[PDB]
Amino acid sequence: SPSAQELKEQGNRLFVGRKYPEAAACYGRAITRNPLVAVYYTNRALCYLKMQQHEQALADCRRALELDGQSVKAHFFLGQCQLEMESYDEAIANLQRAYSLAKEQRLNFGDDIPSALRIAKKKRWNSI
Ligand SMILES: O=C(NN1C(=O)N[C@H](C2CCCCC2)C1=O)c1c[nH]c2c(F)c(F)c(F)c(F)c12
């Protein structure tokens, strides 16, 4: 009955409403209808990160990257996920790649990506 795009929009709305497991199930329904849309996996990965399901978030970022290798969001959310998992070198490389892709695509996220990079590099530094 609902379309894949309607389910993705319901998932986005539920995510803004802090209903992360419900949002993730909507994105799963969207994938069921159309499994070749990267943004359904990137957005579900952010749900999984909020739900502390890091392995599932990593897997969704990987599926998104197979579909859209230039995705700024897939690299950024993968970097944030890796940072929480203490995989610092990979996290920094993915955040740096999100920054380079955002600049190439003329996307403006304010200071979000350099801010995330400093947080990851400071955490890596403190750990070493
Ligand atoms: O996701 C970001 N914001 N955002 C939220 O917090 N809530 C919505 C949310 C709606 C449904 C789930 C997916 C997103 C949203 O779009 C970003 C903020 N700064 C970024 C950033 F620097 C990136 F490089 C990037 F790739 C980014 F995606 C972001």
From Swiss-Prot:
The keyword Magnesium does not apply. The keyword Cell membrane does not apply. Coiled coil: none annotated. The modification Phosphoserine is found at residues 1, 3, 127. It is found in: Cytoplasm; Nucleus; Mitochondrion. Expressed in differentiated myotubes (at protein level). Highly expressed in skeletal muscle, heart, pancreas, brain and placenta. Detected in kidney, liver and lung. TPR repeats lie at residues 4-37, 38-71, 73-105. Keywords: Cytoplasm, Disease variant, DNA damage, DNA repair, Isopeptide bond, Mitochondrion, Neurodegeneration, Nucleus, Phosphoprotein, Repeat, Spinocerebellar ataxia, TPR repeat, Transferase, Ubl conjugation, Ubl conjugation pathway. GO terms for molecular function: enzyme binding; G protein-coupled receptor binding; heat shock protein binding; Hsp70 protein binding; Hsp90 protein binding; kinase binding; misfolded protein binding; protein homodimerization activity. Its main location: cytoplasm. Induction: Up-regulated by inflammatory signals in regulatory T-cells (Treg). Auto-ubiquitinated; mediated by UBE2D1 and UBE2D2 and enhanced in the presence of MAP2K5. GO terms for cellular component: cytoplasm; cytosol; endoplasmic reticulum; mitochondrion; nuclear inclusion body; nucleoplasm; nucleus; protein folding chaperone complex. One of its GO terms (biological process) is cellular response to misfolded protein. Homodimer. Interacts with BAG2. Interacts with E2 ubiquitin conjugating enzymes UBE2D1, UBE2D2 and UBE2D3. Detected in a ternary complex containing STUB1, HSPA1A and HSPBP1. Part of a complex composed of STUB1/CHIP, VCP/p97, CHRNA3, and UBXN2A that modulates the ubiquitination and endoplasmic reticulum-associated degradation (ERAD) of CHRNA3. Within the complex UBXN2A acts as a scaffold protein required for the interaction of CHRNA3 with VCP/p97, this interaction also inhibits CHRNA3 ubiquitination by STUB1/CHIP and subsequently ERAD. Interacts with MKKS. Interacts with DNAAF4. E3 ubiquitin-protein ligase which targets misfolded chaperone substrates towards proteasomal degradation. Plays a role in the maintenance of mitochondrial morphology and promotes mitophagic removal of dysfunctional mitochondria; thereby acts as a protector against apoptosis in response to cellular stress. Negatively regulates vascular smooth muscle contraction, via degradation of the transcriptional activator MYOCD and subsequent loss of transcription of genes involved in vascular smooth muscle contraction. It is linked to Spinocerebellar ataxia, autosomal recessive, 16: A form of spinocerebellar ataxia, a clinically and genetically heterogeneous group of cerebellar disorders. Patients show progressive incoordination of gait and often poor coordination of hands, speech and eye movements, due to degeneration of the cerebellum with variable involvement of the brainstem and spinal cord. SCAR16 is characterized by truncal and limb ataxia resulting in gait instability. Additionally, patients may show dysarthria, nystagmus, spasticity of the lower limbs, and mild peripheral sensory neuropathy. The U-box domain is required for the ubiquitin protein ligase activity. Antibodies against STUB1 are found in patients with chronic lymphocytic leukemia (CLL) and in colorectal cancer patients. This is E3 ubiquitin-protein ligase CHIP. The lineage of its organism: Eukaryota, Metazoa, Chordata, Craniata, Vertebrata. The chain holds residues 23 to 150 of 303 of the full protein.
